[PDB]
Write a protein that binds this ligand. Structure first.
Ligand code: CLR
Ligand code: D10
Lengths: 185, 51, 33
């Protein structure tokens, strides 16, 4: 009873981590503005909105991962690529959930352990690379002059960046859980 | 060596691993459909409710 | 308007902490075996 229970709970947490990963990937609300910020707006990995400032906000929104002539800097490109590999790996293990009927558990848990660890490495590498991309001219113009490489300045980290850190920790702990489960039972 | 076993073998399941290629179709019958559905699901979500 | 979004950060931190605590509790229960 206990073994299948912990397996099911691990699978559920893995699915939750996958939802968190795709959510942080898609959303642009990674880094936000402040009162000291001249131009209100927000930006993420690929999609970003900037205020026109005519009468209200009228935030013009631009940028998608599909286009590679709209990313402010190659650091954001690398971050988005690594998050892509993270999402692909976690989805691959979610597919591997369906592989239990044929393969033995002791191998499938190990396969997702390695897959989740690789997804974690990709996600942390992307998270490390993302602050390096604040040197782009648009980010400097919106946040402020003093904003730069590993320098938030006026801007601040929004819910999505810390949510990506939450997903990183989820990936690590789920990977360790899968590693111990594979040898167990 | 620490509540686990040889770092190489406790992690990597190289033992009993493979001439089990003959079962690949039995894997694919579940592995190829399911994956597509996942992708499909994500795709529609990524463009419908949150696009 | 808010320009800090403090409440959003607080609630998402709480939810993430809850989910990590669930995972850690599961891991500890498994380790006790
Ligand atoms: C088959 C399994 C193993 C992997 C599937 C990965 C899928 C879900 C990935 C691969 C490429 C991805 C797309 C790449 C680019 C974009 C543009 C972006 O603005 C919204 C998300 C969107 C539309 C992604 C959605 C998820 C996506 C379709
Ligand atoms: C019982 C023999 C058939 C099993 C086929 C696998 C499930 C269907 C996958 C579409």
């Amino acid at each position: 009873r206990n073994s299948r229970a912990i397996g099911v709970l691990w699978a559920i947490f893995t699915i939750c981590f996958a939802i968190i990963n795709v959510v942080v990937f898609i959303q642009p609300y990674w880094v936000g503005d402040s009162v000291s910020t001249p131009k209100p707006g927000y930006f993420g990995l690929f999609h970003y909105c900037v205020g026109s400032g005519l009468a209200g906000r009228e935030l013009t929104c631009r940028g998608s991962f599909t286009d590679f002539s709209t990313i402010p800097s190659s650091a954001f490109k690398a971050a988005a690529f690594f998050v892509l590999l993270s999402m692909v790996l976690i989805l691959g293990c979610i597919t591997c959930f369906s592989l239990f009927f044929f393969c033995n558990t002791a191998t499938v848990y190990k396969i997702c352990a390695w897959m989740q660890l690789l997804a974690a490495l990709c996600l942390v590498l992307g998270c490390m690379i993302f602050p390096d991309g604040w040197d782009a001219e648009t980010i400097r113009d919106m946040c402020g002059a003093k904003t730069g490489k590993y320098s938030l300045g006026d801007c601040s980290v929004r819910w999505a960046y810390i949510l990506a850190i939450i997903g990183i920790l989820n990936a690590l702990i789920l990977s360790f859980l899968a590693f111990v489960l594979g040898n167990r039972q | 060596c620490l509540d686990g076993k040889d770092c190489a073998s406790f992690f990597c399941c190289f033992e009993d691993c493979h001439i089990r290629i003959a079962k690949m179709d039995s894997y694919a019958r579940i592995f190829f459909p399911t994956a597509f559905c996942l992708f499909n699901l994500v795709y529609w979500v990524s463009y419908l409710y949150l696009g | 308007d808010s320009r800090d979004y403090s409440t959003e950060l607080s609630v998402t931190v709480a939810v993430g902490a809850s989910l990590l605590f669930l995972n850690i509790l599961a891991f500890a229960a498994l380790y006790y075996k």
